[PDB]
RNA sequence: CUCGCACACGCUUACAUCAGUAACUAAUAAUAUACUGAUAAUUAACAACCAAUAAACCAAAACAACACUAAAACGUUUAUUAAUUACAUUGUUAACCCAACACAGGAGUGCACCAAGGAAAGAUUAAAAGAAGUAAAAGGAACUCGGCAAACACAAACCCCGCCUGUUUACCAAAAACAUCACCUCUAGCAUUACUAGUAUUAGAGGCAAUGCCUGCCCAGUGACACCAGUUUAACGGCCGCGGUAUUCUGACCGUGCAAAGGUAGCAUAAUCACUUGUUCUCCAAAUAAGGACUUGUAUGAAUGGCCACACGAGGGUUUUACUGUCUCUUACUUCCAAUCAGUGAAAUUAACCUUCCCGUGAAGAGGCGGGAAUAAAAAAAUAAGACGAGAAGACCCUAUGGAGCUUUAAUUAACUAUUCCAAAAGUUAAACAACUAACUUAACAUGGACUAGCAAUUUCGGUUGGGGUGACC
RNA sequence: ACCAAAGCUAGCUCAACAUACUAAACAAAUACAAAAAUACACCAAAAUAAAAUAAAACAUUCACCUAACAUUAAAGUAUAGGAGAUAGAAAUUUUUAUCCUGACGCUAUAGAGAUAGUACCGUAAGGGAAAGAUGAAAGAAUAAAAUAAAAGUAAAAAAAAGCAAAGAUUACCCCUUCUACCUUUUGCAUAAUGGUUUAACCAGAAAAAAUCUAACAAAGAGAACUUUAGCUAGAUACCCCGAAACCAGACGAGCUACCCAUGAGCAGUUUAAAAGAACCAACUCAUCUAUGUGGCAAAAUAGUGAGAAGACUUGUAGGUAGAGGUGAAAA
């Protein structure tokens, strides 16, 4: 009906989907971390 | 958009998330579910008797400093093992096989406080 | 891995194609290592073994590039070691068989320092060399004692 | 036409020209007639002859072919036995 | 991701064990089979499909068991029976008239005279009369029953030739087997399961069936009434 | 006037005390839960963290006596070992979260309906128009596409389509679409990840839509089986004419052509090309509406289902009652807007404007040109005829050797998935036959080359045209 | 007179050299849901780049396109190509050290995105800013010193009449004469396009043949070539913004579609009944109308409706991923 409230926060979901461990469990995730490191991001991951 | 930057702390998550602030565990979980402390894991402070001793938190201003010599393994060798080794070589009683009388220790695993794997906190 | 034209007319579609070798399960007998390995080989491997007149021959007689297998290079490292050592455990009961076998392969015999480095990956090599160089750093008590004995023996010989 | 090649950065020649024309040194280009091998039984003797000729290209075509062709093809050639050596220079041209 | 099947339990139990339905999804998580999911919650009763199973390897002989109860089972169409002998109980697929407080014989023994066949009895095919009705039919001897377990189904022993039995499956196809294979004698339980009337779409959902798709597909060549000569006879007898 | 207290999830100090607020946050102040600074604070009993291995147990939750069908979450005890020793660690504020905002929206549970929470009006005035309400003489649908909305009414009937409860285009469609019980076709004889811990009364792929009466004729084409014959229509799909005849219109009969069969039963001016407002009866004072009949519909019609019917429907039509400001034909009064005062303060828009009317003219509809008329300058309130008014590089239309989606009988054809075959690979047989080397075999993998299909991959829609299209042309 | 204006620094760019090439910082903690000292395991892996585009279409083809071998030539030659677009060698040749490293490069809308990969925006991959100016001293702020120049305003509202001006005039108007400008078009005052205005940024690039000027000339060029006045050198030249797309690889199921686990709700009334029955709340939907239409709201408010023990609603955790998924088909 009305939209824009699509984000319904959960910390468990947050960290399971986007967290450090999740990023290191696959080669592609590691490439994400590597790219962010390259660009010099302050936060590599959630 | 949640919060990326702020650090991840036990205050932040659900009930199920408990992360200590870095104090060290004193025990384990027992049979009843109740927690058991192990008297050996709890650090025992060793405190000397200070009453009859004279030294103070500050030093007199006219008292001199000194030329600064960082202690080296060499100087420590010379203040300890060198007089004894010289005494027993001059007497010909020197034994290259066992240096143990001079204070050398072949292996650390026997003694209480070992230096290399570093058994003690402080 | 490559491409082909269908019909071999250059004017037809061009299409990715991959040609895969036909593989077989065959058990082979090594004389020098005295063993039967069950190995996947090609018909080409069997023909090269036939052509070089022995399994062990084929393994010793072929360069690293032509075998292409890490397992081939390890077979070779093994029997090369067995030849340079003249290992008695080959045939413990019969020195007759042992000398007989070690005989025909005498052309490939190489020294020992060479024979254990033959089939090695750069990784395995680096590891091996790291293990040979493995030493617990010598206590400064030792070194200081030797300097002191040098000094005391030169103080004794000067008078 | 490629004006600047990739590897060399030079200017390429269009070979399709080199196969069907011939450049004399004067700047005249020479060509065969079109359809001269085609359907001969259907044609007059006279027409057949008109086809068998070697003919010259008009100015426009000449400039075009020059542009489509590098400098090498314009050099002065001396071939042994060459039929066309007779024709390379121009004579008595009052312009 | 990867899911692990619920189907791991090593030791046999008469007690109902809990199971996880997966609507049509393979272990990868994609849909493999359409139209499956979310029925009633079900526990699973382990069925012993090897009817001849000597309790101890010490005494090999033909043994006898008592039928304690005959219960509804959610997992299959047939009704099942709790059967106890010696120190052990097991679930077996109940024959049509099997009732509580009953006696059932399990035997591997053949003999020249065949046998007078009761219902729950399990015998090697060779031991039965040639017109008998059978269910829970083994393929190779010692394998365990596969064929003819559905509710109210029965096959029939056709003939015995050359130390081998030829039987007729419920699909009216013929099947050839060693005569050393066990089968149970009779029609499987709950014969009226055919005539049950699902009353409303809801009931179908209770059974864990999701509705058909809505897409309209024009019927193809495959459809029509095909009349095919009945297939040749399957033989699990391995010739030398 | 009444969405209150707590917990979970989430938020992260926004909470508390003292002080300050010229300006910054509050869409404005007063002052302060939200701005600023300093200083403090939530204390475990609640909550998180908090054993394994064997073994006996077929017996639902429903106040559970006992049962129903869809067959159901939740543990004891016995044995074997489980460091044994105060105080461990961590969550504890809030007026809070997701919606760019101090957003009339979105948010799980337990208890409450007040004992707890809150304030519709900054101050006036009492114009229009607009919003929301209450009342209305006589009439009672005359309104209108339609009784939409409203009502002191809250009832009855009849059709069409779908059987029914259910589902769907989040943000223009809730339906006659989909699903669905039922009925039917096809495909499978079987084992450790789906189907399925199943086994033809089963499981998949579909069609159609409960029930009732039924489901006629066709295998020539196209499929699919059968690798060819042949079989299949509850597979794709089909189911005709011309001439002559009963005194007369008709045509039982006759002739003949063609087809694989020649549209059967039913129903019918229909949600059914047109003719069409077919014709007639009923209903109304009056009907292209509604209902009933007649009915060649030469373009209905039987599981791409045909016909009746119960019940059901925010489906689409029609009648009656009743009710009414829908209407005749409007009216009064309240609140919000409104206008004036005070505070704060946006948006599209905008070549420049010193921004009249008429007729003529003109890129063919003039504030601006020509010919005339008119004409102190400025606010505030109102109306919408024009500024081809604002919005959005028209969604219609055409064009572009511009795209993409979909379908195939378009042109080129891989991979993959199944089929079939030859070779590869492993083998096996005779010592073959006649007189004086070949042949056959194949468990799972599995290679190279072919075959037939499935599922697909790549690419394209020639131009001219008194717009395109059709036709015609080149 | 306000708003404003002006600096010259921060740093950058391009090369040279160079050793050799993952900086700095590590006490503890860091791959449980990174920064959480402490318990019996598992651990790991590879498959040709493709397409946009050029061929004025597109089907074979289409340089470069994350693979060391440079340079002068051979040579754009041999060759290869729907023999089209285009692609394109080699044999064979040439190459003398080290120091003289800097700048006819930028100066705050420039130069790096950079004061910073920070704020902020995204669930994530990812995107990604703006901003500085006193002096020797501000331990010289009753503070002292040099622009007062953009649009916008104020000082100072307007007075018949008209693309706003021009001819003029003693005189501002009054008089007379002129249908804004770009673009686009056969043709525009057009009621066709674009622009409130100001500042700063913002768009023509190549040397085959030719011409011009000069050297030397039957030869000319500092090697490789060209030459029947040629050769060598110089100078003269060819824009900017914009699709819908296509391909590869990542990231996404906290919304929603459908599943899996695991919890939770359903009061009253009617009925032998918890029967996809009935009435009607909570709850879930979204029928009809009016508001609202830059709104309270990127789908709401008010009334009115439909379901309401089920094919029901709903919390938490998990799954399926774009050639895909999911689908009671509405693409
Ligand atoms: Mg969003
Ligand atoms: Mg964020
Ligand atoms: Mg927490
Ligand atoms: Mg919490
Ligand atoms: Mg305790
Ligand atoms: Mg089941
Ligand atoms: Mg059952
Ligand atoms: Mg179905
Ligand atoms: Mg359907
Ligand atoms: Mg927040
Ligand atoms: Mg505060
Ligand atoms: Mg304020
Ligand atoms: Mg609290
Ligand atoms: Mg007010
Ligand atoms: Mg009013
Ligand atoms: Mg009113
Ligand atoms: Mg009223
Ligand atoms: Mg009235
Ligand atoms: Mg009327
Ligand atoms: Mg009227
Ligand atoms: Mg109404
Ligand atoms: Mg009514
Ligand atoms: Mg009524
Ligand atoms: Mg319906
Ligand atoms: Mg909609
Ligand atoms: Mg919906
Ligand atoms: Mg509805
Ligand atoms: Mg709607
Ligand atoms: Mg339907
Ligand atoms: Mg029937
Ligand atoms: Mg029917
Ligand atoms: Mg039919
Ligand atoms: Mg046929
Ligand atoms: Mg046929
Ligand atoms: Mg009729
Ligand atoms: Mg009609
Ligand atoms: Mg028809
Ligand atoms: Mg059909
Ligand atoms: Mg039809
Ligand atoms: Mg009914
Ligand atoms: Mg109705
Ligand atoms: Mg309904
Ligand atoms: Mg409806
Ligand atoms: Mg009145
Ligand atoms: Mg005001
Ligand atoms: Mg005026
Ligand atoms: Mg006019
Ligand atoms: Mg005039
Ligand atoms: Mg005029
Ligand atoms: Mg108007
Ligand atoms: Mg208009
Ligand atoms: Mg407009
Ligand atoms: Mg346009
Ligand atoms: Mg339009
Ligand atoms: Mg169109
Ligand atoms: Mg064209
Ligand atoms: Mg095209
Ligand atoms: Mg074709
Ligand atoms: Mg292609
Ligand atoms: Mg066309
Ligand atoms: Mg055209
Ligand atoms: Mg036309
Ligand atoms: Mg016309
Ligand atoms: Mg045509
Ligand atoms: Mg092209
Ligand atoms: Mg072009
Ligand atoms: Mg194109
Ligand atoms: Mg390419
Ligand atoms: Mg060729
Ligand atoms: Mg071409
Ligand atoms: Mg900058
Ligand atoms: Mg910048
Ligand atoms: Mg100014
Ligand atoms: Mg004037
Ligand atoms: Mg025009
Ligand atoms: Mg022109
Ligand atoms: Mg004009
Ligand atoms: Mg005009
Ligand atoms: Mg105008
Ligand atoms: Mg115009
Ligand atoms: Mg226009
Ligand atoms: Mg204009
Ligand atoms: Mg234009
Ligand atoms: Mg235009
Ligand atoms: Mg313009
Ligand atoms: Mg404009
Ligand atoms: Mg030149
Ligand atoms: Mg020019
Ligand atoms: Mg393409
Ligand atoms: Mg294209
Ligand atoms: Mg989810
Ligand atoms: Mg109830
Ligand atoms: Mg109900
Ligand atoms: Mg509502
Ligand atoms: Mg109302
Ligand atoms: Mg309601
Ligand atoms: Mg209701
Ligand atoms: Mg109802
Ligand atoms: Mg998930
Ligand atoms: Mg595509
Ligand atoms: Mg798809
Ligand atoms: Mg659904
Ligand atoms: Mg559809
Ligand atoms: Mg559609």
């Amino acid at each position: 009906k009305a939209r824009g409230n699509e984000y319904q926060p959960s910390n468990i979901k947050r960290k399971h989907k986007h967290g450090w461990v999740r990023r290191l469990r696959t080669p592609t995730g590691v490439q994400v971390i590597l790219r962010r490191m390259h660009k010099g991001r302050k936060s590599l991951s959630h | 958009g949640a919060d990326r930057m702020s650090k991840w702390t036990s205050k932040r998550g659900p009930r199920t998330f408990c992360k200590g602030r870095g104090a060290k565990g004193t025990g384990f979980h027992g049979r009843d579910g109740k927690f058991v402390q192990i008297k050996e894991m709890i650090p025992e402070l060793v405190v000397p008797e200070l009453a009859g001793f004279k030294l103070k938190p500050y030093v007199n201003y006219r008292a001199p400093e000194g030329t600064d010599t960082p202690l080296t393994a060499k100087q420590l060798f010379l203040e300890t093992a060198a007089p004894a080794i010289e005494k027993d070589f001059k007497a010909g009683t020197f034994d290259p096989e066992h240096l143990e009388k001079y204070g050398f220790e072949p292996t650390q695993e026997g003694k209480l406080f070992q230096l290399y794997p570093k058994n003690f906190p402080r | 891995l490559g491409h082909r034209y269908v019909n071999n007319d250059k004017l037809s579609k061009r299409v990715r194609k991959v040609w895969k070798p036909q593989l077989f399960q065959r058990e082979l007998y090594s004389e020098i290592l005295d063993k039967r390995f069950t190995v996947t080989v090609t018909m080409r491997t069997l023909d090269l073994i036939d052509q070089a007149c022995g399994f062990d021959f084929y393994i010793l007689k072929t360069p690293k590039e032509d075998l292409c297998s890490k397992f081939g290079m390890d077979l070779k490292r093994g029997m090369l070691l067995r030849l340079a050592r003249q290992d008695p455990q080959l045939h413990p009961d019969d020195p007759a068989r042992r000398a007989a076998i070690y005989d025909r392969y005498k052309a490939f015999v190489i020294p020992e320092a060479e024979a254990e480095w033959v089939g090695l990956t750069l990784d395995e090599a680096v590891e091996k060399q790291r293990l040979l160089e493995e030493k617990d750093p010598i206590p400064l008590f030792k070194i200081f004692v030797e300097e002191l004995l040098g000094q005391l023996q030169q103080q004794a010989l000067s008078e | 036409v490629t004006y600047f090649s990739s590897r060399k950065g030079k200017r390429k020649t269009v070979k399709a020209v080199i196969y069907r024309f011939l450049r004399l040194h004067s700047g005249l280009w020479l060509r065969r007639k079109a359809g001269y091998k085609k359907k001969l039984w259907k044609k007059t003797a006279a027409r057949k002859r008109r086809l068998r000729e070697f003919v010259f290209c008009n100015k426009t075509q000449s400039k075009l072919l020059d542009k489509m062709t590098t400098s090498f093809w314009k050099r002065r050639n001396w071939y042994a036995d060459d039929p066309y050596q007779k024709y390379q220079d121009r004579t008595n041209l009052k312009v | 991701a990867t899911s692990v099947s619920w189907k791991s339990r090593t030791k046999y139990t008469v007690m109902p064990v809990k199971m996880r339905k997966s609507g049509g999804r393979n272990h990868t998580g994609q849909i493999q089979v359409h139209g499956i999911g979310g029925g009633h919650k079900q526990r699973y009763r382990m069925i012993d499909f090897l009817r001849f199973r000597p309790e101890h390897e010490s005494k090999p002989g033909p043994f006898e068991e008592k039928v304690i109860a005959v219960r509804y089972d959610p997992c299959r169409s047939a009704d099942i029976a709790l059967v106890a002998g010696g120190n052990r109980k097991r679930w077996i697929i109940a024959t049509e008239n099997m009732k509580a407080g009953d006696t059932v014989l399990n035997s591997d023994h053949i003999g020249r005279m065949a046998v007078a066949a009761r219902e729950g009895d399990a015998h090697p095919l060779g031991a039965l009369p040639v017109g008998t009705l059978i269910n829970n039919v083994e393929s190779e001897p010692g394998r365990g029953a596969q064929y003819i377990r559905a509710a109210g189904t029965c096959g029939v022993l056709l003939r015995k030739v050359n130390g081998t039995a030829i039987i007729q499956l419920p699909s009216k196809r013929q099947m050839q087997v060693l005569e050393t294979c066990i089968a149970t004698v009779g029609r499987v339980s709950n014969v009226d399961h055919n005539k049950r009337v699902i009353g409303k779409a809801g009931r179908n959902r209770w059974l864990g069936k999701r509705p058909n798709s809505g897409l309209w597909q024009r019927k193809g060549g495959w459809a029509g009434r095909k009349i095919r000569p009945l297939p040749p006879m399957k033989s699990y007898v391995k010739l030398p």
Side-chain angles (χ1 to χ4, degrees):
Chain A
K1 306 178 68 178
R3 317 275 268 104
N5 62 336
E6 290 93 54
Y7 173 69
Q8 305 288 340
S10 151
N11 283 313
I12 299 175
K13 293 213 165 179
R14 203 179 102 238
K15 287 251 169 194
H16 275 6
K17 295 179 180 187
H18 312 308
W20 179 254
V21 176
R22 175 63 176 264
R23 294 252 176 272
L24 302 192
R25 280 317 161 244
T26 158
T28 65
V30 171
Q31 287 169 67
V32 172
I33 299 289
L34 283 173
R35 272 186 272 117
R36 300 208 109 212
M37 279 170 46
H38 178 47
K39 198 169 185 185
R41 290 284 196 180
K42 182 179 180 173
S43 137
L44 294 191
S45 157
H46 270 267
Chain B
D3 196 329
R4 266 227 211 193
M5 302 301 176
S6 302
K7 46 177 187 171
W8 192 223
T9 305
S10 223
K11 313 221 169 199
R12 238 137 119 0
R15 255 143 86 254
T16 352
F17 186 64
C18 336
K19 177 180 71 165
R21 285 306 198 105
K24 304 262 193 179
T26 68
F28 65 94
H29 290 300
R31 309 184 178 204
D32 315 344
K34 76 169 179 180
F35 184 88
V36 187
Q37 243 156 127
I38 303 184
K39 290 189 176 178
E40 328 295 331
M41 297 180 88
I42 296 165
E44 178 189 5
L45 292 169
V46 178
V47 206
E49 181 250 356
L50 321 176
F53 132 111
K54 42 112 185 177
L55 229 27
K56 305 294 175 56
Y58 308 93
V59 187
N60 188 339
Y61 256 116
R62 86 185 81 241
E65 327 94 13
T67 62
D68 310 306
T69 59
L71 182 66
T72 322
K74 190 140 186 175
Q75 309 173 21
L76 182 69
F77 183 71
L78 300 185
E79 308 301 324
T80 301
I85 282 184
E86 190 156 353
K87 260 178 201 169
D88 276 331
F89 191 48
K90 229 77 167 184
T93 331
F94 185 85
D95 313 325
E97 313 111 14
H98 356 92
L99 273 52
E100 311 184 356
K101 52 177 177 180
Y102 301 105
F104 173 90
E105 314 198 24
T107 37
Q108 300 273 307
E109 88 293 294
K111 56 165 179 174
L112 177 58
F113 309 112
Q114 19 222 99
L115 296 173
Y116 173 58
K118 183 85 176 202
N119 258 11
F120 58 101
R122 269 174 89 88
Chain C
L1 295 166
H3 302 247
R4 72 175 221 267
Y5 294 130
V6 316
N7 313 332
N8 292 79
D9 318 316
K10 173 208 181 277
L11 286 193
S12 305
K13 286 230 170 194
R14 185 243 278 134
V15 148
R16 50 180 48 245
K17 168 78 169 190
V18 38
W19 283 280
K20 297 181 182 178
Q22 185 176 32
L23 296 176
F24 296 108
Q25 217 60 29
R26 231 63 120 193
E27 48 170 358
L28 316 169
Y29 189 101
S30 174
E31 294 279 24
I32 312 179
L33 303 182
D34 225 32
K35 205 165 181 174
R36 293 203 172 196
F37 308 99
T38 295
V39 175
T40 344
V41 293
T42 327
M43 204 46 57
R44 173 153 214 286
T45 316
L46 293 197
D47 287 336
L48 288 178
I49 291 170
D50 259 318
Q51 168 181 345
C53 288
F55 179 68
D56 308 77
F57 267 112
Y58 165 77
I59 282 166
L60 296 159
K61 206 173 118 194
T62 336
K64 173 186 169 187
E65 308 91 10
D66 235 331
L67 283 176
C68 279
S69 31
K70 172 58 185 178
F71 174 69
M73 291 302 294
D74 280 335
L75 242 28
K76 169 186 263 191
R77 186 153 49 86
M79 56 190 53
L80 225 62
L81 276 189
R82 221 168 210 192
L83 255 48
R85 286 169 182 169
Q86 221 84 215
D87 257 327
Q89 43 181 358
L90 161 57
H91 253 125
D93 330 330
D94 295 329
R97 274 222 222 174
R98 199 182 310 142
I101 293 179
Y102 283 157
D103 173 46
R104 21 216 274 196
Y105 301 112
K106 279 172 181 179
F108 314 97
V109 179
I110 208 179
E112 182 72 8
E114 305 272 340
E116 51 191 2
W117 296 72
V118 40
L120 290 206
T121 315
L122 189 63
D123 305 28
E124 302 183 332
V126 160
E127 170 70 357
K128 185 174 187 179
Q129 181 65 19
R130 162 266 195 78
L131 284 191
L132 305 187
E133 292 186 327
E134 185 107 26
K135 296 166 186 178
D136 303 35
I138 3 186
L140 278 194
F141 207 88
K142 297 308 184 185
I143 297 180
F144 283 158
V145 155
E146 291 179 6
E147 276 179 2
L148 203 62
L149 281 197
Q151 291 184 353
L152 243 163
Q153 283 175 2
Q154 276 201 18
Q155 284 181 4
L157 279 174
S158 66
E159 295 183 26
Chain D
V1 169
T2 291
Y3 301 106
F4 298 102
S5 64
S6 183
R7 319 283 215 79
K8 273 295 157 75
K10 301 184 169 176
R11 172 196 197 106
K12 296 187 174 181
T13 222
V14 179
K15 288 288 184 199
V17 175
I18 255 43
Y19 293 146
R20 27 212 121 173
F21 299 83
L22 162 68
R23 192 190 131 88
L24 313 180
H25 186 84
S26 170
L28 298 195
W29 288 83
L30 193 74
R31 68 163 230 250
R32 222 84 150 77
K33 215 94 165 56
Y36 84 98
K37 304 159 63 179
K38 272 297 184 60
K39 298 177 190 297
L40 291 198
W41 62 269
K42 197 196 279 200
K43 293 179 184 193
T44 311
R47 191 179 172 189
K48 261 177 257 190
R49 174 133 40 259
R50 244 176 274 128
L51 292 182
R52 259 179 282 108
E53 297 285 353
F54 298 73
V55 292
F56 288 122
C57 316
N58 74 330
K59 184 187 185 183
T60 310
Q61 287 162 358
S62 288
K63 285 189 47 181
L64 167 70
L65 292 183
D66 275 325
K67 283 190 214 163
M68 283 207 263
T69 263
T70 345
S71 152
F72 166 94
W73 298 94
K74 301 157 197 176
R75 78 188 298 268
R76 176 44 131 314
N77 284 334
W78 308 96
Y79 299 119
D81 300 333
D82 185 36
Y84 297 107
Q85 185 176 297
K86 186 188 176 186
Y87 298 110
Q88 301 257 300
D89 244 289
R90 223 96 141 65
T91 101
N92 293 345
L93 191 47
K94 295 222 168 186
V95 168
Chain E
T2 8
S3 59
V4 219
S5 186
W6 69 273
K7 288 189 189 182
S8 74
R9 151 180 226 92
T10 319
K11 306 173 231 158
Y12 184 90
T13 317
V14 121
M15 301 228 48
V17 62
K18 54 170 296 187
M19 51 173 291
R20 314 190 321 260
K21 37 179 61 83
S22 75
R25 323 290 152 124
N26 46 67
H27 62 284
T28 309
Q30 347 245 334
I31 283 182
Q32 195 156 344
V33 188
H34 285 93
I36 291 183
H40 202 295
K41 176 84 88 65
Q42 306 175 328
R43 290 211 250 51
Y44 168 73
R45 345 270 150 152
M46 312 180 77
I47 311 303
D48 201 345
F49 278 101
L50 186 64
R51 240 305 199 74
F52 189 80
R53 179 165 257 147
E55 196 168 328
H56 305 294
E57 316 110 24
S58 58
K59 39 183 172 179
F63 63 95
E64 198 219 291
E65 290 184 286
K66 190 172 183 194
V67 171
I68 298 172
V70 178
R71 298 306 166 87
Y72 170 93
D73 184 31
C75 293
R76 58 185 52 69
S77 48
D79 301 333
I80 68 180
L82 178 57
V83 155
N87 261 316
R88 130 274 210 90
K89 309 168 167 187
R90 6 113 100 172
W91 295 103
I92 68 169
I93 299 219
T95 1
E96 174 181 5
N97 300 290
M98 239 155 88
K99 65 189 171 183
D102 218 331
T103 263
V104 166
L105 170 64
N106 300 316
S107 164
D108 66 337
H109 175 73
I110 328 192
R112 20 185 295 107
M113 301 284 96
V115 152
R118 303 147 72 198
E119 245 179 270
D121 290 340
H123 291 103
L125 289 179
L128 295 171
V130 90
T132 325
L133 265 37
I134 49 184
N135 56 48
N136 297 115
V137 180
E138 238 172 359
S139 177
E140 309 159 44
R143 186 178 179 81
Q146 280 173 316
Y147 312 83
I148 325 183
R149 330 148 154 195
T153 57
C154 61
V156 56
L157 187 36
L158 287 185
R159 62 172 172 171
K160 292 177 254 175
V161 176
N162 192 19
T164 263
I166 295 185
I167 86 178
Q168 190 211 40
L169 287 171
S171 64
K172 298 175 179 175
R173 182 178 188 179
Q174 297 181 348
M175 176 179 161
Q176 157 154 297
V177 173
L178 295 186
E179 101 274 29
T180 338
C181 286
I182 320 297
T184 307
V185 187
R187 322 187 50 239
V188 198
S189 301
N190 200 15
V191 199
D192 285 330
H193 176 263
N194 228 330
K195 305 173 185 182
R196 86 167 322 183
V197 174
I198 289 90
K200 51 175 190 169
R203 183 161 274 102
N204 259 331
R205 304 298 244 105
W206 298 343
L207 303 177
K209 307 171 167 294
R210 306 203 282 100
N212 296 152
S213 148
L215 183 62
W216 183 90
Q217 310 186 35
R218 176 175 301 95
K219 287 164 171 169
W222 56 274
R225 188 153 129 281
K226 310 307 166 63
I227 301 173
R228 290 148 102 250
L230 183 77
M233 169 188 63
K234 255 287 177 179
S235 59
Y236 302 89
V237 166
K238 290 180 176 177
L239 291 178

